[PDB]
Design a protein around this ligand. Structure first.
Ligand SMILES: CC(=O)N[C@@H]1[C@@H](O)[C@H](O[C@@H]2O[C@H](CO)[C@@H](O[C@@H]3O[C@H](CO)[C@@H](O[C@@H]4O[C@H](CO)[C@@H](O[C@@H]5O[C@H](CO)[C@@H](O[C@@H]6O[C@H](CO)[C@@H](O)[C@H](O)[C@H]6NC(C)=O)[C@H](O)[C@H]5NC(C)=O)[C@H](O)[C@H]4NC(C)=O)[C@H](O)[C@H]3NC(C)=O)[C@H](O)[C@H]2NC(C)=O)[C@@H](CO)O[C@H]1O
Ligand SMILES: CC(=O)N[C@@H]1[C@@H](O)[C@H](O[C@@H]2O[C@H](CO)[C@@H](O[C@@H]3O[C@H](CO)[C@@H](O[C@@H]4O[C@H](CO)[C@@H](O[C@@H]5O[C@H](CO)[C@@H](O[C@@H]6O[C@H](CO)[C@@H](O)[C@H](O)[C@H]6NC(C)=O)[C@H](O)[C@H]5NC(C)=O)[C@H](O)[C@H]4NC(C)=O)[C@H](O)[C@H]3NC(C)=O)[C@H](O)[C@H]2NC(C)=O)[C@@H](CO)O[C@H]1O
Ligand SMILES: CC(=O)N[C@@H]1[C@@H](O)[C@H](O[C@@H]2O[C@H](CO)[C@@H](O[C@@H]3O[C@H](CO)[C@@H](O[C@@H]4O[C@H](CO)[C@@H](O[C@@H]5O[C@H](CO)[C@@H](O[C@@H]6O[C@H](CO)[C@@H](O)[C@H](O)[C@H]6NC(C)=O)[C@H](O)[C@H]5NC(C)=O)[C@H](O)[C@H]4NC(C)=O)[C@H](O)[C@H]3NC(C)=O)[C@H](O)[C@H]2NC(C)=O)[C@@H](CO)O[C@H]1O
Ligand SMILES: CCCCCCCCOCCOCCOCCOCCO
Ligand SMILES: CCCCCCCCOCCOCCOCCOCCO
Ligand SMILES: CCCCCCCCOCCOCCOCCOCCO
Ligand SMILES: CCCCCCCCOCCOCCOCCOCCO
Ligand SMILES: CCCCCCCCOCCOCCOCCOCCO
Ligand SMILES: CCCCCCCCOCCOCCOCCOCCO
Ligand code: NA
Ligand code: NA
Ligand code: NA
Ligand code: NA
Ligand code: NA
Ligand code: NA
Ligand code: NA
Ligand code: NA
Ligand code: NA
Lengths: 341, 341, 341
């Protein structure tokens, strides 16, 4: 009659996240600046459901999750479906970790996002860049992913393969595979990742992409922590064209009592096409943040960033190639709250 | 091991609402009448999540809500996302009330909707009317809203500002601000509200709208209750054109035991443009309802209403201006159930 | 302070369902085969909410349900709204069963789907077929449905009427009615169903459809179970054209310990238009499945099927009529898990 935790086969969880963000654009077109700029609220709150089940006739524990999307993000309309964020089934066992099937982060993307896209470095380092094809997927459906245990309390591997965006609609045969490794060494973690995308259709060509990443994260007892990554992107099109672009991201943090101060920088360097540098195809971003640990479950923050994007390039079909710079340079001031339950 | 209310950081709530509604149109086109008319089910059921948190390092209590949309309304397809209805974060404290950020009702809209759009008066008084620009927003994202306490057990204020519809997509610089006040005087409540909309783009112009509302609600011990409102809408276009339209809504109720009888009437008067009345631009609606208090948590009702809309007008771009009358006059017979948990 | 089942006015339930499915198409176009074929994940997981309420002033118990859609099906994008699957309100009482209003299965469709579209027979027997108009609705909004009690522990009836697809958007006056009966005797159940669709607009005509179904299901104590159905579809267009097509579906199962072996076959026979057979308008499918009862709440399965579809036909507007064969023949190998809570 009285309920326990074991009375339920699911749990509801959530991340309640609201950011008030003011953007100031300098696109070269005053009307476009007025349109894209100004104050918005960016409600990234989401609700999820998850659970486990020990099946009577199978030793590896069954796991599942269904996570909703952002309920009212800036630059978007209201409402999100269930299953827009990480949404999967899987199995887990102590000696081999876990396997998930469904919609998850790629091993490469997980590292690109965290630590290296925070705070607000994502327009440059996450989905920014100028290279053709698909540098990497991000959160991707039709994926199988293995997460190894922490071998010897030090070393872990994340590996995955999946269908591409067109393949997921029965509209292509794109696919990808990726792997990441992590090694804990005193106050450091060393990171490495790879992703290969294949049969990518864009700009009248079929592309193969190969992306490589190396990184470090460090946490010291005096309150200083940091990260740094280098990311190398290569792409080859079916007409013989080769492209290369690299990038970096770094962050420095100082944590004292209930406060964290943070500086971030990321850059994409000029793209190279068939051995020739395309001028002014670089991007960078600098960001500063103060965060207050308002509760063990929540943070408040204030953030200021400046994005300086590339000046444009054409793709292999002689039309403009869309990038995160297409809408123009901008600065952003924001405040926010994130609460977890 | 055993759970209490305090074991959870959220609560699920819902409004289960189903209306069977038969419409009889007289548009002037028999096929359009057949299409728009007939029986539908209007399933306005919705599920929401809400909660609070006392952050360790901040006195004002944190609040949040994420409310789903109508799951299967008439004239619409099935399915609603989380966050389509009131969806926000905020803080509250006894001495100053509450502040919410996100998607909420405007102070004006809240009064227009309740009491004054019920029962079925909304096609005229809520989103009906012929004025250009944006008379007011309704439920709006990118909003900050303050709700005062009840000062001296008599007086309260609701105030808000927010981004407009285009601004929320990075496609404009529209915005609005509004305020409402409520004063309790014996068996009466006096209401007043304002909303100003700015930088509204429509019909080739930029518009400013100013809307004003005054109202009364009464509840007497003999079972009679009522409301009445007057609403004045003004609009000025960037080409110099001025428009004005006013409106009213009233309702009379008699409650005895488990029954409420209700009569409603609302009208929009003829629109004026640059000092000249546009003939046959008025609308009105009469509605009758019987409601049964089937449970402390639920009602059953039967409702009959007749809408007589305007005969059309052009906007400032020499094309027809859409109104709630564009689809034609209709009557509607309905029955329904609403249950709250 | 401590919670019981009665502390809540709702319950969350779910079906967690994941299928890894590899398709091999032979459409006649190698690129289309590459696009439609390959491996996808078909995540048919969904979350629902349901509950009941005994209203103080009405004897029949109030019931309601809001069921989410498939969170990430194959050939589709991520995310589902609440209310995409069976979503209704209703009342129930011991002596007369239950009545539901909202979005439910039609009586015909319920039998077509279960038992007769399993395993993977649906491309042929569910939404397959070549007949014009609307052979039947499936899961349909704007419906009222009665489910009788099990009279004398043997006999039950399902009856429903509803608005059509266009009517639900205010874009037509289509509607339907249907009924099914079930009779249980010893190890058998006998099934019969009917659906009539009216005012269906397609191919420049208005159509009336009448579909009839008879079936048997058997379950024996030695572990053998089976089903078989015959389905007869007739359609008449407003220009005088008559069409007829019939179909069947059958399955054989052997259950021993924690295993079920299953073979399925379904076929649509050649369509007849105005008394003339249209050659090569048939379809069939053969399917084999092994299922493991991995837990009382879950199954694992492996499945192989071969679809051989019709070679095409024109509708009454001299353009190709879309069928489940339009994309071409294919075979599919799959494995999956389904878990209920
Ligand atoms: C181990 C760990 O995680 N520890 C804790 C840590 O998590 C905690 O901090 C929090 O971490 C999480 C996880 O890292 C952070 O979550 C991230 O938050 C960012 C945003 O803040 C998310 O960024 C989004 O990424 C998606 C991709 O997944 C972006 O997609 C792009 O969206 C843009 C919109 O601007 C699109 O632009 C438009 O595109 C079209 C055409 O394509 C064009 O026509 C339009 O004009 C154009 N632009 C317009 C209209 O302006 C763009 O197309 C699209 N990209 C495409 C198609 O390729 C999305 O926009 C990003 N969001 C933005 C921007 O706001 C990020 O995904 C998310 N990560 C994950 C994994 O979900 C979280 O931010 C962080 N919180 C804080 C406060 O820092 C901390 C506690 O703080 O504790 C650690 O221990
Ligand atoms: C303090 C308190 O609250 N006390 C209790 C009280 O709550 C209880 O009574 C209940 O109260 C609630 C709150 O007042 C009531 O909830 C309201 O219910 C109505 C409908 O029942 C909701 O009305 C909707 O409002 C929105 C926003 O304004 C409408 O949006 C418009 O929708 C129409 C659809 O027809 C659109 O038309 C189409 O438009 C396009 C072009 O734009 C055109 O091409 C199409 O042809 C056209 N039409 C077609 C296809 O038919 C229109 O575009 C759009 N808006 C625009 C353009 O701006 C929406 O349609 C309305 N829906 C209706 C009507 O069905 C209202 O929003 C909602 N309020 C809130 C706040 O959410 C509730 O009804 C009430 N219940 C009962 C039983 O009376 C009472 C009793 O329980 O107790 C008190 O104590
Ligand atoms: C009593 C009882 O239930 N007992 C237990 C039993 O339930 C348990 O087993 C499980 O049973 C359930 C219930 O029977 C099974 O659930 C069913 O599963 C199937 C799918 O596996 C569902 O099928 C869907 O049906 C809908 C409606 O008919 C389909 O809609 C169609 O989708 C196609 C897909 O492409 C559309 O095609 C596209 O259309 C456009 C335009 O026309 C075209 O341009 C595109 O090219 C085209 N194709 C593309 C892009 O590829 C099509 O248009 C549309 N419909 C129409 C009318 O047009 C939907 O697609 C089907 N799903 C597909 C395909 O995957 C079925 O609805 C569902 N039933 C219910 C009621 O929801 C479940 O499968 C079963 N599990 C197992 C493991 O077998 C068992 C234990 O497991 O125990 C019993 O006791
Ligand atoms: C980018 C590397 C950051 C290194 C921070 C310094 C860590 C050790 O310093 C010791 C002095 O403070 C005590
Ligand atoms: C992390 C080491 C510091 C590297 C700084 C130079 C990186 C190049 O940035 C381009 C600036 O122009
Ligand atoms: C300021 C308070 O004003 C209250 C007056 O209410 C007038 C309502 O009249 C409506 C007429 O239809
Ligand atoms: C508190 C008492 C409220 C009394 C409300 C009386 C409202 C009178 O009815 C107004 C409805 O008008 C019907 C049509 O008349 C059109 C004339 O247009 C000009 C309006 O003055
Ligand atoms: C002269 O009147 C002709 C009717 O024109 C249509 C007006 O619509 C009904 C409006 O009712 C409210 C009047 O204020
Ligand atoms: C449509 C053809 C399928 C018919 C197959 C029926 C096989 C059933 O075999 C019956 C023999 O039963 C032997 C054991 O009987 C156990 C008691 O069963 C009670 C009723 O199921
Ligand atoms: Na703007
Ligand atoms: Na938004
Ligand atoms: Na992708
Ligand atoms: Na109709
Ligand atoms: Na609907
Ligand atoms: Na609006
Ligand atoms: Na494919
Ligand atoms: Na999918
Ligand atoms: Na349908």
């Amino acid at each position: 009659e009285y309920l326990t935790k074991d009375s339920f086969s699911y749990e509801v969880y959530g991340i309640i996240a609201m950011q008030a963000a003011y953007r100031d654009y300098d696109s070269g077109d005053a009307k476009q600046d007025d349109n894209l700029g100004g104050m918005q609220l960016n409600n990234e709150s989401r609700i999820g459901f998850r659970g486990k089940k020990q099946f009577a006739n199978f030793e590896p524990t069954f796991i599942w999750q269904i996570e909703g999307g952002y309920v009212d993000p800036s630059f978007g309309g209201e409402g999100a479906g269930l299953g827009e964020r990480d949404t999967f089934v899987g199995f887990e066992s102590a000696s081999w970790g876990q396997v998930r099937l469904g919609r998850v982060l790629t091993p490469m993307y997980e590292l690109v996002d965290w630590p290296a896209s925070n705070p607000g470095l994502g327009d440059v380092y996450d989905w920014g860049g100028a290279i053709g094809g698909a540098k990497y997927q991000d959160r991707q459906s039709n994926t199988i992913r293995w997460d190894s245990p922490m071998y010897a309390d030090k070393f872990s591997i994340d590996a995955a393969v999946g269908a591409g965006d067109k393949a997921g609609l029965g509209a292509g045969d794109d696919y990808w595979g990726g792997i990441a490794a992590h090694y804990k060494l005193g106050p450091l973690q060393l990171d490495a990742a790879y992703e290969g995308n294949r049969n990518i259709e864009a700009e009248g060509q079929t592309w193969e992409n190969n992306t490589y990443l190396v990184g470090v994260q460090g946490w010291f007892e005096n309150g200083i922590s940091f990260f740094a990554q280098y990311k190398y992107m290569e792409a080859d099109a079916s007409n013989g064209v080769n492209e290369k672009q690299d990038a970096m991201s770094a962050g420095l943090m100082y944590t004292t009592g209930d406060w964290q101060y943070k500086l971030g920088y990321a850059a994409n360097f000029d793209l190279e096409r068939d051995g020739k540098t395309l001028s002014n195809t670089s991007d960078d971003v600098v960001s500063a943040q103060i965060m207050y640990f308002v509760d063990p479950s929540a943070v408040l923050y204030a953030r200021a960033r400046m994005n300086d994007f590339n000046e444009g390039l054409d793709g292999l079909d002689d039309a403009a190639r869309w990038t995160s710079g297409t809408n123009g340079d901008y600065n952003e001031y924001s405040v926010g709250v994130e609460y977890y339950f």
